[PDB]
Every structure is written in C-alpha cells, then in structure tokens.
Amino acid sequence: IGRLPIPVPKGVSVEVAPGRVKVKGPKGELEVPVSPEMRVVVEEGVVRVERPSDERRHKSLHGLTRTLIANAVKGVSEGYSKELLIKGIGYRARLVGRALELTVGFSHPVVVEPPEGITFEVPEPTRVRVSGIDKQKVGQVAANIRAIRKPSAYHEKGIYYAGEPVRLKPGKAG
Amino acid sequence: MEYRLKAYYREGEKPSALRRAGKLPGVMYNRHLNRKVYVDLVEFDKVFRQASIHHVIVLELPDGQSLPTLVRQVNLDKRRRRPEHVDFFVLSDEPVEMYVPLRFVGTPAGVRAGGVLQEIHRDILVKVSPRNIPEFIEVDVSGLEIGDSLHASDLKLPPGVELAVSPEETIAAVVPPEDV
C-alpha cells in the first residue's frame, strides 16, 4: 500500500549483490543493506521494497531498506554535500587542502583531514561547510566539527549546521 | 428493549460454567410462575446499561415469547462487580413496585449561589401506576442554600399519580461546601 514506494531513474547502476544492494552512481557503489526476507525490485523506472509479512519488525524494516537504498541511489545520482555555516567572531575558516583548520579555542592548530566523499568548502569563511557522498558519514563529520567548538545558547561564537535558532540564555543582571 | 437465551441446570455450578462461556445465570420470574433462563453478558449488559432500562422494563424476546420485564433482584459479584446472577419479573398488570427514573431541575441557587452543592438522595422514585410510567418522574425547585432540603412531601405527583413510599423524608438538599 504505502511504505515501500520509490522511482529509480538516471540509468542508476541499481543492482542487487550478495546480501547487499549495490547502488552505483557518481563514484561509490553505496552499499545499501539487505535482509533475507525484505527482498526488492527495480524495473524500467520503478524501485520497490517488498514486505514478506506485516509485523512490527518488518514494517519498520520496510520503511528502512526503502528510504535507505532510496538514499543510496538518489545519492549515487549526485554525491552529497553538507550545508554547514560557521559563524563566530571567534573563529577562522580556511581549507588548507585536505584539512580542517578553523578555531575559537585560541590555540588554532585545528588540523583535520576530510575522510572521503568529504571535501571542504570555505567560500567565506562564514558560509563554510562540507560535501561528502555517504548521507550519514557527512552528517556525522559535520557534527564532529560542529560540536568540537560550537555550543553557546547564551552568547554565541559557534559552528552551526543550517544554524538552528539556538537558545538565548540571558546573563548577569536584567 | 431486550431478550435472552434459556437455562436448564441452576442454583450455581452450571451457571458458573456459563459465566465462563460469557453467560451469567438468569432467574426468570413472574407473579408466582418461574424458571431459569440464561444471560449472555456482552449485550445483556448493553441493554441493562441503558439503565432507564433497570428501572423502567422493556420487551425481551426469549424463544419467541415476547414478554415484559424489569429487574427485581440480581447478584453482581463484588470481586469485580458484573454479576453472579441476573433476576427479572415479567409483569401482567398491577404495577405497584416502581423505582423509576427521577429528574428535577434544581433551578440553580446552589453552587452558583452559596457555592452550596446539590446532594440527591432519591434521584429515583418507588411508587405505583400499573404498567404506566416513562423515564422521567419529575420535579424541581430554585431554593438551593439556606440549609434547604426538598422532600417526598412537596413531591409533585404527575400523571399516573401514586406515592408508594413515605410521608416525606426529603428528595435531596443544599450542602454548604463552604456555608450558605
């Protein structure tokens, strides 16, 4: 009925492997997992997740494999870039090539090294974030950076994903 | 309106097995004639539930003998309530034993006056009027504070008049939740 519906365009290399569905698009044959009963189809332009029963575990499973491989593919069509905005009079942003940089923790040696699909975009450096390939991996790294110097809901000099409105805890007397 | 499905062996044992089934024991009684029929709970209840149908009888279809009945006695099982045995009277004509639905408007002057809240003792009435009384024996009274109380006296006996209870005693009254 509705918990398994997706379209598989692009001439996507959307192909079932040995326990893993290999979704190949720009570079990575993203591994979108596969459980034994789930089972799925991809014909012409239609991509469907199967439901070998209708219990709790499966139902979720459906939502999963579905949205997931869904990902795998839409992804492979593009790649995946992360929208991160650094903002803080107490911070600098520069790529250096294959590395973090940036700081508010007054002893700037902030040397990271974009794992993979991850590339660094500093055109600012306020608007400055990353690109990846792996839906999550990207999110995760972003969090890495963010958290490592970010929080501040009362006075702020931080790194913000999209830049959520974040709290505004007043201070001394007022 | 109501109905039922017949018995065989009673007093207790079998009926119990019934409860099990989903049927509680039923005593079928009329002016000096009687036999046991059985209670299929679920619906039994629904109707019962009507309550207006617990005071004011209705027609029960049993084997086709469409007849008139009211509750005259019953055993609801303390341990969870519900029953231990359901008892009714099918009635010819002479209705004297009536504890029928009682309504009244306590035309505010209580909790919207002295805060006084209205306690109801009767809510219902047991008098006479052969196979003839609705779901509303009724009365009313704005007086709702001074220590005020209304009784079987003032009463106010509509249509098929017939006080079969007492020379007063009160229907209810205004209690000071906090004075007045």
Binding site: - | R49, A51, H54, V74, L76, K78, R79, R80, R81, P83, Y99, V111, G115, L117, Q118, E119, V175, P176, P177, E178
Partner: protein, 136 residues
Amino acid sequence: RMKYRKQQRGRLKGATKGGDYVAFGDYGLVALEPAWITAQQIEAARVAMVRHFRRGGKIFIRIFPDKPYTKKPLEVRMGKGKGNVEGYVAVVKPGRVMFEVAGVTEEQAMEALRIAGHKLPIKTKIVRRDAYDEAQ
C-alpha cells in the same frame, strides 16, 4: 482519626472480604487489596481531596476509624499484657466502597482521589456505581 468513646482494649488478627459496594455521590474510591488503614493516613486522603477541590465542595466518607492496636511497649522485651493503645484505624480488605462525594463534576475529583489513594495504603482503583442499588 475518629472512634471517640469506644468501649474496649482491642481486636486482634484475621480477614478476607466484607460488604462495602454501592456508591453515594459517584466520586468513588474502590479500595481494592488491603487490610486496616490508619484513620490518619485516611485523613491524608481526606485532606488531599479537600485541597484538590477548589477548597469547598464537600466530600463524604466511608469506612470508620473503628479499631485500636498496640506495639505494646515502645520497644522493650516482650511480655506485658499487650498493654497500651496506640494506633486507630479502619478495616477494609476486599475492594470496597470508599465513598467520596464533593461536587467536582470531574475526573478532577477523580485525580484528587486518584492519588490521595494511589498513595494511601495500597492497591486500589476508582469509579462510580452502575448496577445502581436498591435499599428499603
């Protein structure tokens, strides 16, 4: 608590059911699995209700603070004539008609009770009569 002017020393031990049930306002506490209960604690619930309510609409009652218990000494050895009377309570053991009117016209009264008891001294539930009840 209350039992003023009693008549004797004490009761003793036993118990398994009774005869509490009806209704009486339709704001009721159906005691469920118990034993005696401190006339005081009782007062607890009393209060509890009283306050929850907007502080006036009057509740009712139920089981009385009828019995007297003794821990006997204060903590000594054990042999006195079980002397001394120290606690006074109600005695309800098989789900009972704990009767609490008030005029809250609400699951509000529900609440007040709800906890007065949830607290109280045990396992119990609450409700309203629905099999009515016929007296003389």
